[PDB]
Design an enzyme around this catalytic site. Structure first.
Site, PDB file in Angstrom:
ATOM      1  N   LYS A   1      15.601   2.735   3.599  1.00  0.00           N
ATOM      2  CA  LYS A   1      15.469   2.618   2.156  1.00  0.00           C
ATOM      3  C   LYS A   1      14.346   3.495   1.625  1.00  0.00           C
ATOM      4  O   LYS A   1      13.267   3.580   2.217  1.00  0.00           O
ATOM      5  CB  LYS A   1      15.310   1.176   1.678  1.00  0.00           C
ATOM      6  CG  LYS A   1      16.678   0.550   1.411  1.00  0.00           C
ATOM      7  CD  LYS A   1      16.642  -0.860   0.790  1.00  0.00           C
ATOM      8  CE  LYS A   1      18.028  -1.210   0.224  1.00  0.00           C
ATOM      9  NZ  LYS A   1      18.900  -1.909   1.231  1.00  0.00           N
TER      10      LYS A   1
ATOM     11  N   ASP B   1       8.964  -7.350   1.433  1.00  0.00           N
ATOM     12  CA  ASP B   1       9.659  -8.315   0.569  1.00  0.00           C
ATOM     13  C   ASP B   1       9.258  -9.760   0.859  1.00  0.00           C
ATOM     14  O   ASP B   1      10.100 -10.639   1.055  1.00  0.00           O
ATOM     15  CB  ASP B   1      11.174  -8.136   0.631  1.00  0.00           C
ATOM     16  CG  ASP B   1      11.633  -6.805   0.030  1.00  0.00           C
ATOM     17  OD1 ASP B   1      10.942  -6.287  -0.897  1.00  0.00           O
ATOM     18  OD2 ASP B   1      12.680  -6.287   0.492  1.00  0.00           O
TER      19      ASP B   1
ATOM     20  N   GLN C   1      -6.224  -1.972  -8.617  1.00  0.00           N
ATOM     21  CA  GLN C   1      -6.888  -1.176  -7.587  1.00  0.00           C
ATOM     22  C   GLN C   1      -8.365  -0.970  -7.907  1.00  0.00           C
ATOM     23  O   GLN C   1      -9.214  -1.034  -7.017  1.00  0.00           O
ATOM     24  CB  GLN C   1      -6.191   0.185  -7.440  1.00  0.00           C
ATOM     25  CG  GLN C   1      -6.847   1.139  -6.439  1.00  0.00           C
ATOM     26  CD  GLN C   1      -6.401   0.835  -5.010  1.00  0.00           C
ATOM     27  OE1 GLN C   1      -5.458   0.073  -4.796  1.00  0.00           O
ATOM     28  NE2 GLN C   1      -7.069   1.432  -4.031  1.00  0.00           N
TER      29      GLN C   1
ATOM     30  N   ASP D   1      -4.807  -3.808   3.194  1.00  0.00           N
ATOM     31  CA  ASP D   1      -5.426  -4.367   2.004  1.00  0.00           C
ATOM     32  C   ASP D   1      -4.884  -5.743   1.631  1.00  0.00           C
ATOM     33  O   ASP D   1      -5.081  -6.178   0.495  1.00  0.00           O
ATOM     34  CB  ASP D   1      -5.289  -3.397   0.831  1.00  0.00           C
ATOM     35  CG  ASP D   1      -6.441  -2.417   0.751  1.00  0.00           C
ATOM     36  OD1 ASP D   1      -7.364  -2.456   1.615  1.00  0.00           O
ATOM     37  OD2 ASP D   1      -6.427  -1.608  -0.202  1.00  0.00           O
TER      38      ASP D   1
ATOM     39  N   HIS E   1      -7.323  -8.298  -0.175  1.00  0.00           N
ATOM     40  CA  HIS E   1      -8.082  -8.036  -1.426  1.00  0.00           C
ATOM     41  C   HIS E   1      -7.913  -9.211  -2.397  1.00  0.00           C
ATOM     42  O   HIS E   1      -6.805  -9.760  -2.477  1.00  0.00           O
ATOM     43  CB  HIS E   1      -7.681  -6.692  -2.042  1.00  0.00           C
ATOM     44  CG  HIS E   1      -8.622  -5.586  -1.703  1.00  0.00           C
ATOM     45  ND1 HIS E   1      -9.927  -5.573  -2.140  1.00  0.00           N
ATOM     46  CD2 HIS E   1      -8.461  -4.470  -0.964  1.00  0.00           C
ATOM     47  CE1 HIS E   1     -10.525  -4.493  -1.692  1.00  0.00           C
ATOM     48  NE2 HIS E   1      -9.650  -3.802  -0.968  1.00  0.00           N
TER      49      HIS E   1
ATOM     50  N   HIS F   1     -12.676  -8.513   2.610  1.00  0.00           N
ATOM     51  CA  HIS F   1     -11.236  -8.449   2.369  1.00  0.00           C
ATOM     52  C   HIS F   1     -10.460  -8.096   3.640  1.00  0.00           C
ATOM     53  O   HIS F   1      -9.347  -8.602   3.851  1.00  0.00           O
ATOM     54  CB  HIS F   1     -10.915  -7.508   1.202  1.00  0.00           C
ATOM     55  CG  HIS F   1     -11.097  -6.060   1.525  1.00  0.00           C
ATOM     56  ND1 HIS F   1     -12.270  -5.382   1.264  1.00  0.00           N
ATOM     57  CD2 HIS F   1     -10.254  -5.156   2.082  1.00  0.00           C
ATOM     58  CE1 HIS F   1     -12.146  -4.130   1.660  1.00  0.00           C
ATOM     59  NE2 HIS F   1     -10.933  -3.965   2.155  1.00  0.00           N
TER      60      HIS F   1
ATOM     61  N   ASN G   1     -10.735  22.745   3.258  1.00  0.00           N
ATOM     62  CA  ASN G   1     -10.080  21.542   2.752  1.00  0.00           C
ATOM     63  C   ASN G   1     -10.982  20.321   2.917  1.00  0.00           C
ATOM     64  O   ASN G   1     -11.017  19.440   2.050  1.00  0.00           O
ATOM     65  CB  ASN G   1      -8.761  21.337   3.508  1.00  0.00           C
ATOM     66  CG  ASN G   1      -7.691  20.654   2.673  1.00  0.00           C
ATOM     67  OD1 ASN G   1      -7.805  20.531   1.456  1.00  0.00           O
ATOM     68  ND2 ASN G   1      -6.619  20.239   3.333  1.00  0.00           N
TER      69      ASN G   1
ATOM     70  N   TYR H   1     -16.158   4.976  -9.793  1.00  0.00           N
ATOM     71  CA  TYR H   1     -16.478   3.711  -9.142  1.00  0.00           C
ATOM     72  C   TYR H   1     -17.836   3.186  -9.588  1.00  0.00           C
ATOM     73  O   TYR H   1     -17.998   1.979  -9.801  1.00  0.00           O
ATOM     74  CB  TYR H   1     -16.404   3.872  -7.622  1.00  0.00           C
ATOM     75  CG  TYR H   1     -15.091   4.463  -7.120  1.00  0.00           C
ATOM     76  CD1 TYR H   1     -13.907   4.278  -7.822  1.00  0.00           C
ATOM     77  CD2 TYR H   1     -15.041   5.195  -5.939  1.00  0.00           C
ATOM     78  CE1 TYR H   1     -12.708   4.811  -7.366  1.00  0.00           C
ATOM     79  CE2 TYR H   1     -13.839   5.736  -5.470  1.00  0.00           C
ATOM     80  CZ  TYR H   1     -12.676   5.542  -6.190  1.00  0.00           C
ATOM     81  OH  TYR H   1     -11.475   6.077  -5.745  1.00  0.00           O
TER      82      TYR H   1
END
Ligand SMILES: Nc1ncnc2c1ncn2[C@H]1C[C@H](O)[C@@H](COP(=O)(O)OP(=O)(O)OP(=O)(O)O)O1
Ligand SMILES: Nc1ncnc2c1ncn2[C@H]1C[C@H](O)[C@@H](COP(=O)(O)OP(=O)(O)OP(=O)(O)O)O1
Ligand SMILES: [Zn+2]
Ligand SMILES: [Zn+2]
EC number: 3.1.5.-
Lengths: 434, 430
Positions: free
Chosen positions: B2, B23, B35, B93, B96, B119, B235, B251
């Site tokens: 999927k 799900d 977030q 996560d 959280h 978390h 990079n 932040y």
RNA sequence: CGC
RNA sequence: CGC
């Protein structure tokens, strides 16, 4: 003044009078209503809410009037005209309910088929409530507005008029009622914002360049009416915008699973309506379907109602809760088919509730074991001219889809549901589904 | 398979096992946690939630682990290994709380200074709770996973180890523990760098795709470490710079941090009067929901609106703080300082700070009037390889005031500057 | 049936 | 004090 940094428009400058209207519970409510309703459960990028869209609409409304005001001082566009247009841009979606279009497009017609309601009428009521409970009228006078007529102007840009029908501005400024929402061609700054914003969040790609369209727009005489006009060379940008509009509808707004999910949320709300209580003015208690009748209550009616049902323990809410839980588990209603009305009536909102009965009452006489009730069928009614000027002569001019889903996911009901669906379309002379 | 169409990554293909994990109520919960927490109240584009980020992290994790194994068959990278690293990415996560970092970063310290909670620990508990509440163990088996050791391997990727301290995978696959969370170079940062830039309108100059296709596992000091190619060093600089632009501009934003502390204040004043039902009918608070995952499943950013729409008189104090956020009558900034060369301030001492500021000294102010916020971020340690030799390598402290008259505001400034003198901290600028 |  |  204050700058708000938007990913779509960059730095947005807000007149202090806009800030005061924004910093109210009636405007901050828009942070808790998803722009695309249930589409988020299909597109993970579509988390944006009505709030940031409304800032964008308020901002583009201003850019357009202020661009038109500089290039055509003969239009006599005051800075009071500018603020009234921005306010209308900010506030045009104030009346949107939980999951935006799913609330006035499907929930309210199913729950109260006798009531006529649009989110726009809600915006007018919510705007009036926003002003009265925050003393915005004096702040308007302080900044040069004349409340009685300017509030009339702002409401008419939102919902329309109640010869020349408007009463907030005279005929020589008719082009001002074309900015925030255009009831004649469907090109307005609100479309510009959400085309760009929805593309951004869906990862669909947007070719339309709204800034070039603003840079080259002009008011011109077209049949003795002042109308905003695009330059004749800029037809290519307009072709791109219409192709973006068609991609968003075909890909996002009419997505098969996304629409199914909207009807599941509406189903859950309908099962919850008798038991959720929202406290409105005076301590009077309202239901989901009746919060639209008291603006204090409506202020507290947002997407939160999904989680309040999902997190509830009340036994009377169990049926509603289990519909939301099936969304999480991804056991959704199943698609049966699609159809179109043939040169026929708009299937009307007052009739949305009678539809599942007609489908079950249809007679597929190729008879099989399984029979289905109305409660097993969902019926989904999906409801869906530019003047130009050459630069050598600058003021011279030149439908319904119907989907059926089934709440039972077995091979036999789905096979039967199809037979009822195919039969139902013949009865009403709709196109043959296949 | 999927496909999920994401704006950061295009098409994401999901193995059927991942769909089964996604799900569940435990995973869908993540749709209801911002977030960037309170940062939405400063950045209107930052409406994104933990869910879409988590899918990105699972996707990026598979991309990296799958590109390593196809380019270096000597690493013996199974599909069991790939699926486990994806699940770790999908679920890192899970733990959280409301407003992401504002929950375990400030609230739990202020509400229960005894407990030491993260978390990540929640994610381990929430994962275990997710696996058992939805019968994932049989599904893992029908797709080739050995649950008892693979659940350990997934848990260890999320929270770390309790000689070779890991027990989910042997040392010859040490590199697999570097993909989800690390030197600080992992797929999680890659997704949120891109995802946050996209919603904030900041430019991301790091290209994760280029890092992925040129990455190689090499031996470095007896351990197999993931190494970038020499030509990707530019990079890496851009990566380290967009990281630093995100912290300084988003932040650690002044108003957004003030808003975060207003929500936390609201939560502490509501804490004794909200009841969340957990396992067995037992009731929990915002602060104890972390001790019962059934309760924690129902603790999302919705707790903000429950307070805001509440009519209980006992919730009036909390409600009025939230109502002050809507009106934009926020706490006021007083100043900034750092523990230069000093012991870093620890979480267990967070609640003692507002009285230390009223301690050190016409109008005088009490501890109620002071908010003390402790802002934490958390060249070398990244190894590069050359083409011809492909197997060998070469705290902020802010104080806010709750009384916004010019007289109390100038007073709080002096309480602050004196407090830093007593604690060996820098003297604030203007 | 987040093609 | 949604620089
Ligand atoms: N059928 C639809 N037509 C138009 N917009 C829709 C439809 N379904 C969902 N939407 C979304 C697209 C935009 O994000 C938003 C536009 O809202 P509005 O301008 O009030 O009409 O609603
Ligand atoms: N101090 C911080 N350090 C890192 N990320 C932070 C901080 N505060 C908020 N965030 C945001 C950035 C990302 O969107 C997300 C990272 O979550 P994590 O569990 O650390 O991985 O949280
Ligand atoms: Zn709109
Ligand atoms: Zn993360």
């Amino acid at each position: 003044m204050k700058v708000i940094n938007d990913p779509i428009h960059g730095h947005i400058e807000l007149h202090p009078l806009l800030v005061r209207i924004i910093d109210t519970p009636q405007f901050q409510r828009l942070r808790y209503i998803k722009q695309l309703g249930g589409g988020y459960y299909v597109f993970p990028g579509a988390s944006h809410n009505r709030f940031e869209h409304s800032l964008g609409v308020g901002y583009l409304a201003g850019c357009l009037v202020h661009a038109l005001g500089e290039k055509q001082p003969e239009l006599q566009i005051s800075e009071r005209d500018v603020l009234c247009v921005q306010i209308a841009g900010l506030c045009h979606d104030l009346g949107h309910g939980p999951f935006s279009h799913m609330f006035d497009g499907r929930f309210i017609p199913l729950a109260r088929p006798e009531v006529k309601w649009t989110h726009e009428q809600g915006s007018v009521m919510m705007f009036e409530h926003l002003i009265n409970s925050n003393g915005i009228k004096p702040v308007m006078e302080q900044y040069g507005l004349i409340p009685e007529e300017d509030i009339c102007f702002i409401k008419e840009q939102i919902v329309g008029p109640l010869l020349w029908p408007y009463k907030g501005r005279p005929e020589n400024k008719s082009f001002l009622y074309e900015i925030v929402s255009n009831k004649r061609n469907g090109i307005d700054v609100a479309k510009w914002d959400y085309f760009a914003r929805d593309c951004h969040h869906l990862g669909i790609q947007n070719n339309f360049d709204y800034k070039r369209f603003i840079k080259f727009a002009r008011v011109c005489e077209v049949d003795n009416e002042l109308r905003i006009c695009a330059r004749d060379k800029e037809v290519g940008n307009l072709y791109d915008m219409f192709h973006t509009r068609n991609s968003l509808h075909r890909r996002a707004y009419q997505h098969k699973v996304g629409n199914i999910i909207d009807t599941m949320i509406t189903d859950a709300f309908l099962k919850a309506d008798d038991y959720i209580e929202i406290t409105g003015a005076g301590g009077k208690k309202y239901r989901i379907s009746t919060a639209i009748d008291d603006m204090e209550a409506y202020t507290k009616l947002t997407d939160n109602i999904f989680l309040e049902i999902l997190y509830s323990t009340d036994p009377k809410l169990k049926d509603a809760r289990e519909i939301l839980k099936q969304i999480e588990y991804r056991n959704l209603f199943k698609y049966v088919g699609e159809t179109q009305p043939t040169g026929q009536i708009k299937i009307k909102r007052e009739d949305y509730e009678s539809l599942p009965k007609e489908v079950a009452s249809a007679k597929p006489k190729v008879l099989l074991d399984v029979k289905l009730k109305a409660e097993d069928f969902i019926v989904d009614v999906i409801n869906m001219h530019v003047s130009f000027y050459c630069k050598t002569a600058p003021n011279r001019a030149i439908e319904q889809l119907i989907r059926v889903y089934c709440k039972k996911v077995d091979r036999k009901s789905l096979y039967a549901a199809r037979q009822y669906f195919v039969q139902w379309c013949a009865d009403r002379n709709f196109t043959k589904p296949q």
